[PDB]
Write a protein that binds this ligand. Structure first.
Ligand SMILES: [Zn+2]
Lengths: 191, 136, 52
RNA sequence: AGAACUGGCGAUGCGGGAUGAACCGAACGUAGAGUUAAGGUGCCGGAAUACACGCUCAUCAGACACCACAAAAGGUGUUAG
RNA sequence: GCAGUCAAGCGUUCAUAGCGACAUUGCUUUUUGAUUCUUCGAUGUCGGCUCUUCCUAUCAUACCGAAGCAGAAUUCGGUAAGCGUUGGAUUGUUCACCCACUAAUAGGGAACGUGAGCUGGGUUUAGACCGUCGUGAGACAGGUUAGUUUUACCCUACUGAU
């Protein structure tokens, strides 16, 4: 029905800074720098009082209005990722075969290899995306920790681990094997 | 061959198509074997399924004891009489075509083998090499 | 050992889903319409069967 | 396949429906000028890539009577009630 | 012949895993009818052999989804025609039924593909026999046996070659 004016606000905290060049959002904070290309959405940014940013859509349809809210969420995810960080935690579950995962290095890429998954002799390799820091957890049995700034790079690298250890030609309800997300949190403490 | 035999066999030149009559080389009582099929044989238009040394075939007894006739039974070819080449470049052949009656799992119905057997048949069927006296 | 503390964590992505009656697609549990265009985004959804 | 009324084709070209004996327009001496019919005006193709309000995105969109096919049933696709 | 809609019921309980009555909506032109538009100054008629290509309503192989899927084996469904889909006894057979191999022995179109490509076993002249019918000559979508398969050097197409 072509909503004349729909608008969402973006709250920017103390330490970080946001710079936009005609759609190119650059969020720079204590943990680093994040850049995103949003040139496929066609929204309008405006700075109000150096602590709040407003995004406006003029004469947009229902689908185009639905693309307004995802703009604010993507920028907020970029903002919270450079102050609080993003920390994904997984657990290894197996019935008989202990899954062995180690950090390897070929051609300077820091792959993640998986061994002894359901007794398979094949070594599945998972490449670590840039910005994601992989660390093995302490005092918890079979836990891996994925940490980084970009939520869409930590979770996608996380999704690669979850989808590489699939079970085929068996009953999924019985063979409870895989690398599953346990908790999606933040890197910084107290929050 | 197929099921029953462990290990792989190099290709031996085909000399026994469907309808060939080969002598019975063991003391099972049969006199000859009539090949009607070859186990593990491919399918091609107008192409006759042809057997080689060491292959498992379906054969019927045409002469011999009346208890062994008019029924389908597995058989294993031990002599070919058609010249075939081994990996070591030697072309060899026997005088006649010979077979032994066996079960699908590869155990011989008979107890002893008369005449020589091929080397490729001996290492593919343990129950045939144990009953043979001379290998090539 | 199943360790039910990890069974429900594994059951989140394995059995606690939904099945479309037409295209057999695996769907989120509390979804009402299938995400597949080939069945016309139908609403005939069923819970995923669990082992006995 | 067989009747009723009327108009046509057969006996009929012309403009239109890309194309067609029947449909639409209109029926024909030889020429000129002007205006239109039916049908069209992105290019092939002569004529506005005119104006105005909306609807539709289709991983087999749709596009014009006769006419060269599509239904029951469905869709938190979108729009209006 | 093939595919949907509705869901009374079957399914140990549980309609929709799988099915599915009573009804109802369609699709296909590989069946058989109906029609008589084209061809009776002739478009060579069944089947097989041979060979090419196409269709998907998928038998197998590839990747997946679902199950009353533990494993194994199967079942149902999706993307899919890329690549394969046989050797024989009987019958002229199409069709069919058995033997057997195989991952599998899926269904069809191309003037019911293909006779100046073949074959002539079937059908359908003239010879002859039998049965039934007819006074008889003769009749039989009844059985049986014997019975000439012509021509390219033209144009195009295609294969190679100047
Ligand atoms: Zn669906």
């Amino acid at each position: 029905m072509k909503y004349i004016q729909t608008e969402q606000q973006i709250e920017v905290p103390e330490g970080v800074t946001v710079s936009i060049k005609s759609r190119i959002v650059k969020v720079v904070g204590p943990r680093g720098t994040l850049t995103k290309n949003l040139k496929h959405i066609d929204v309008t940014f405006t700075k109000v009082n150096n602590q709040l940013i407003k995004v406006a859509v003029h004469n947009g349809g229902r689908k185009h209005v639905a693309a307004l809210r995802t703009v604010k969420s993507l920028v907020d995810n970029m903002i919270t990722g450079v102050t609080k960080g993003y920390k994904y935690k997984m657990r290894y579950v197996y019935a008989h075969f202990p899954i062995n995962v180690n950090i390897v290095e070929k051609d300077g890429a820091k792959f993640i290899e998986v061994r002894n998954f359901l007794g398979d002799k094949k070594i599945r390799n998972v490449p670590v995306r840039d910005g994601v820091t992989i660390e093995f957890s302490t005092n918890v049995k079979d836990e891996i920790v994925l940490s980084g700034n970009s939520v869409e790079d930590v979770s996608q690298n996380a999704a690669d681990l979850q989808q590489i250890c699939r079970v085929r030609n068996k009953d999924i309800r019985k063979f409870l094997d895989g690398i599953y997300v346990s908790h999606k949190g933040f890197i910084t403490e107290d929050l | 061959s197929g099921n029953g035999a462990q290990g792989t066999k190099f290709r031996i030149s085909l000399g026994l198509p469907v309808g060939a009559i080969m002598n019975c080389a063991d003391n099972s009582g049969a006199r000859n074997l009539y090949i009607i099929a070859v186990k593990g044989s491919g399918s091609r238009l107008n192409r006759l399924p042809a057997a080689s040394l060491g292959d498992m075939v379906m054969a019927t007894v045409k002469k011999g004891k009346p208890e062994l006739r008019k029924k389908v039974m597995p058989a294993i070819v031990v002599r070919q009489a058609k010249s075939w080449r081994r990996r070591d470049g030697v072309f060899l052949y026997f005088e006649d075509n010979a077979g032994v009656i066996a079960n699908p799992k590869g155990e011989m119905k008979g107890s002893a083998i008369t005449g020589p057997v091929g080397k490729e048949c001996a290492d593919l069927w343990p129950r045939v090499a144990s009953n043979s006296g001379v290998v090539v | 050992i199943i360790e039910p503390s990890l069974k429900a964590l594994a059951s989140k992505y394995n059995c606690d889903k939904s099945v479309c009656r037409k295209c057999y697609a695996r769907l989120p549990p509390r979804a009402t319409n299938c995400r597949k265009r080939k069945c016309g985004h139908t609403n005939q959804l069923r819970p995923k069967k669990k082992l006995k």
